[PDB]
Design a protein around this ligand. Structure first.
Ligand SMILES: *[C@@H]1O[C@H](CO)[C@@H](O)[C@H](O)[C@H]1NC(C)=O
Ligand SMILES: *[C@@H]1O[C@H](CO)[C@@H](O)[C@H](O)[C@H]1NC(C)=O
Ligand SMILES: *[C@@H]1O[C@H](CO)[C@@H](O)[C@H](O)[C@H]1NC(C)=O
Ligand SMILES: *[C@@H]1O[C@H](CO)[C@@H](O)[C@H](O)[C@H]1NC(C)=O
Ligand SMILES: *[C@@H]1O[C@H](CO)[C@@H](O)[C@H](O)[C@H]1NC(C)=O
Ligand SMILES: *[C@@H]1O[C@H](CO)[C@@H](O)[C@H](O)[C@H]1NC(C)=O
Ligand SMILES: *[C@@H]1O[C@H](CO)[C@@H](O)[C@H](O)[C@H]1NC(C)=O
Ligand SMILES: *[C@@H]1O[C@H](CO)[C@@H](O)[C@H](O)[C@H]1NC(C)=O
Lengths: 99, 148, 50, 294, 128
């Protein structure tokens, strides 16, 4: 998903890329640096925002999102969720799930 | 002289949408508000088709301790018209509720009803303490522990 | 007069052609596709109409 | 439960001419006083449509047997019926017409239409046994003898009758077009009083759409459902049936054609031109006009 | 715990279970964005005296623009005209004499835009 013109939770809610990118994307496997036996959950991700990102916009807000019709007022509950879930990076994870 | 410089238009500010009356009410009340739910081995599949499906009633009712959707977000389900929907109605213990999801194991996930790793759909349950329990114990719901 | 009428009529009918695009309706293609593909389809329509 | 009838004995085919019949409205767009050219599946003009009596008396003894042939479904069908006693009741559509593959069923009794998509186990001779009541005789009770069993039903449709009550030379022409495109079964229909014309009449009647069923099944072959007023246990010498099958039905096959339709001020298609019929029609289609100057 | 599993089938087959089709209020005689039974467009709507046959939904007298359409909720027939457009011309003497100009709007009324209405359009800034 780290490429222009693509859609999804990261291309929309974490890193929007403009369709006119000039530059290079580089990525490598990081199993033996990032993953721990008990799982490293120090890297957090977003699943729900109010709208899609504009390119290179970096939103670090931790406001509890409203999934229902009632306001959350910074407090979780029914149809109220924190924005960031943790990732279960483990050294035994499959190709899909390793960092 | 005379010179054509620009072009005149009127940009609109408001948009209107008109659709015909919502008619074909999908069977949902007969599933979620049903008086009786079958056992965990005579599981109730009911096929829902040829009806308009309102999901905000369920997802914004706040009577479901589990709303877990795989392959689809629960808020855009109103903006989709599927070929068919299979409504699976039962009753199950709370500690076993975590077993109704793809990729899981357990006596229910292995010996009652297997969900494939590639599910597209939603699991939703609500506490039936005041509906399915009796003082002397309701043993009309049967559970298997052994299979070949 | 006839020629001029034809000259306009054909022109307007050229709005109904795809010219290789999925739809001859720019609004339909946009209401369907995100910018990075709607742009290719709109480019095809632009070429045909121009 | 079904009842076995006699062998059909493979009656030889008979043809008749379709003088400008089978034209339906292709779109749901009101068009007024203009000529529109559409390329769609139409019945070609002046075509040979194969016609069958509902009841044929052909034996030397005088045997009465339904002519209910099993017929293909090639890219749409134009089904016309000239009857006066509601002896044709519906159709079945499918590929294998057994429990292996899904199939579509349409029947019409006195009150409503029954449309079902299921895996019916049809018998060789599906039919409806029709009996009058002893005192009223205003309506006609029907016993369905079409299928042995049905399973895996995925569709159900009930509405007002497709066929009007026909309850003595007041024959009626019912013209229908069936198409199966993109998983939708489209039905076009028109009803017209006819008079003293044995075969299809000469004229132009445009078929207004009836209904679009999202059946989503494969259709290759079809049959016709008939009403038996006589008794299969005891066949009478004569007159037990309806006047030796005076009523009849015609079937022609739709093919890809380009038609020039003329919408009048009130939005009705009043005339059509088949571009591939003759050089005059080709000239008319090229000029987009019904009249051609020298 | 009362449990329902809703399995949704998304295949290359026509849909029979659909979501709600949210609609809005009718705005007549005004330039608006309209969405009638899936046709999206921009224009003004007026009451029409045309009669549609029961199977007919839309209208195309010119075969390239949908002039009329039947409203889905109320069965009234309403037509559609394009929101007034047209070129803008500047009428000027040479700047070497004066910087005063007049503006001509071609083929529009003086309501959509010292005003003079001509068959050529609406003229603003020039005395009659
Ligand atoms: C069940 O009934 C209640 C009435 O208290 C209603 O609010 C709810 O929407 C119903 N659920 C369904 C699925 O119809
Ligand atoms: C139609 O049938 C007649 C015989 O009844 C035959 O002479 C003629 O060639 C046929 N025409 C076509 C187009 O099949
Ligand atoms: C017409 O047929 C249906 C079944 O196909 C039956 O249920 C109904 O009773 C029939 N109509 C009458 C008036 O009996
Ligand atoms: C169309 O219908 C109107 C009456 O509804 C009538 O005045 C007009 O003459 C008709 N045009 C035709 C098709 O003759
Ligand atoms: C929709 O409902 C209104 C009444 O609320 C009615 O007047 C109108 O005819 C209905 N339209 C359709 C297409 O059923
Ligand atoms: C035009 O203006 C110029 C100055 O830019 C001046 O030299 C000239 O005399 C003017 N001519 C006329 C005819 O107004
Ligand atoms: C539009 O222009 C005409 C002149 O042709 C005029 O009669 C009419 O009143 C104008 N419309 C409005 C709304 O003023
Ligand atoms: C022209 O004269 C008439 C009277 O004959 C008057 O009504 C009108 O306003 C005048 N127009 C102008 C532009 O002076």
């Amino acid at each position: 998903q780290i490429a222009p013109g693509q859609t999804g939770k990261i291309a929309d809610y974490n890193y929007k890329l403009p369709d006119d990118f000039t530059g290079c994307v580089i990525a490598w496997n990081s199993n033996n640096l990032d993953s721990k036996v008990g799982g490293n959950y120090n890297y957090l991700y977003r699943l729900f925002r109010k709208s899609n990102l504009k390119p290179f916009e970096r939103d670090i807000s931790t406001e509890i999102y409203q999934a229902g019709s009632t306001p959350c007022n910074g407090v979780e509950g029914f149809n109220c969720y924190f924005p960031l879930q943790s990732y279960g990076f483990q050294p035994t994870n499959g190709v899909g799930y390793q960092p | 002289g005379i010179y054509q410089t620009s072009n005149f238009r009127v940009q609109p500010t408001e948009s209107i949408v008109r659709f015909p009356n919502i008619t074909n009410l999908c069977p949902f009340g007969e599933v979620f508000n049903a008086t009786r739910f079958a056992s965990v081995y005579a599981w109730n599949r009911k096929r829902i088709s040829n009806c308009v499906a309102d999901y905000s009633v369920l997802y914004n009712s706040a009577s479901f301790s589990t709303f877990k959707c795989y392959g689809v977000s629960p808020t855009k389900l109103n903006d989709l018209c599927f070929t068919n929907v299979y409504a699976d109605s039962f009753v199950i213990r709370g500690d076993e509720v975590r077993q109704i999801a793809p990729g899981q194991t357990g006596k229910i996930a292995d010996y009652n009803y297997k969900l494939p790793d590639d599910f597209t759909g939603c699991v939703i349950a609500w506490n039936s303490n005041n509906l399915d329990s009796k003082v002397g114990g309701n043993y009309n719901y049967l559970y298997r522990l052994f299979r070949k | 007069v006839n020629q001029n009428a034809q000259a306009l009529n054909t022109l307007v009918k050229q709005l109904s052609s795809n010219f290789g695009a999925i739809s001859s309706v720019l609004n339909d293609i946009l209401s369907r596709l995100d910018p990075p593909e709607a742009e290719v389809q709109i480019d095809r329509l632009i070429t045909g109409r121009l | 439960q079904c009842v076995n009838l006699t062998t059909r004995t493979q009656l030889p085919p008979a043809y008749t001419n379709s003088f400008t019949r089978g034209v339906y409205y292709p779109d749901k767009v009101f068009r007024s006083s203009v000529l529109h050219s559409t390329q769609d599946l139409f019945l070609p003009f002046f075509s040979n449509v194969t016609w069958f009596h509902a009841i044929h008396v052909s034996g030397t003894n005088g045997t009465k047997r339904f002519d209910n042939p099993v017929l293909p479904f090639n890219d749409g069908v134009y089904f016309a019926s000239t009857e006066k006693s509601n002896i044709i009741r519906g159709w079945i559509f499918g590929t294998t017409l057994d429990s292996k593959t899904q199939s579509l069923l349409i029947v019409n009794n006195a009150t409503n239409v029954v449309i079902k998509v299921c895996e019916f186990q049809f018998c060789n001779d599906p039919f409806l046994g029709v009996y009058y009541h002893k005192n009223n005789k205003s309506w006609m009770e029907s016993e369905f003898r079409v299928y042995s069993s049905a399973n895996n039903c995925t569709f159900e449709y009930v509405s007002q009758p497709f066929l009007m009550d026909l309850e003595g030379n007041f024959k009626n022409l019912r013209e229908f077009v069936f198409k199966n495109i993109d998983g939708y079964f489209k039905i076009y229909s028109k009803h017209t009083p006819i008079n003293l014309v044995r075969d299809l009449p000469q004229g132009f009647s445009a078929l207004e759409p009836l209904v679009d069923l999202p059946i989503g099944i494969n259709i290759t072959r079809f049959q016709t459902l008939l009403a038996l007023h006589r008794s299969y246990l005891t066949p009478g010498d004569s007159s037990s049936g309806w006047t030796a099958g005076a009523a009849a039905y015609y079937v022609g096959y739709l093919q890809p054609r380009t038609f020039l339709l003329k919408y009048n001020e009130n939005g009705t298609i009043t005339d059509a031109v088949d571009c591939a019929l003759d050089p005059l029609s080709e000239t008319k289609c090229t000029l987009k006009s019904f009249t051609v100057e020298k | 715990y009362r449990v329902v599993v809703l399995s949704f089938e998304l295949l290359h087959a026509p849909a029979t279970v659909c979501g709600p089709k949210k609609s809005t209020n009718l705005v007549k005689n005004k330039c608006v964005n309209f969405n009638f039974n899936g046709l999206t467009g921009t224009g003004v709507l007026t009451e029409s005296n045309k009669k549609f046959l029961p199977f007919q939904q839309f209208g195309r007298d010119i075969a390239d623009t949908t002039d009329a359409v039947r409203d889905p909720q109320t069965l009234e027939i309403l037509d559609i005209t394009p929101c007034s457009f047209g070129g803008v011309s500047v009428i000027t003497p040479g700047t070497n004499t004066s910087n005063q100009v007049a503006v001509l709007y071609q083929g529009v009324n003086c309501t959509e835009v010292n005003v003079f209405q001509t068959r050529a359009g609406c003229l603003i800034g020039a005395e009659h």
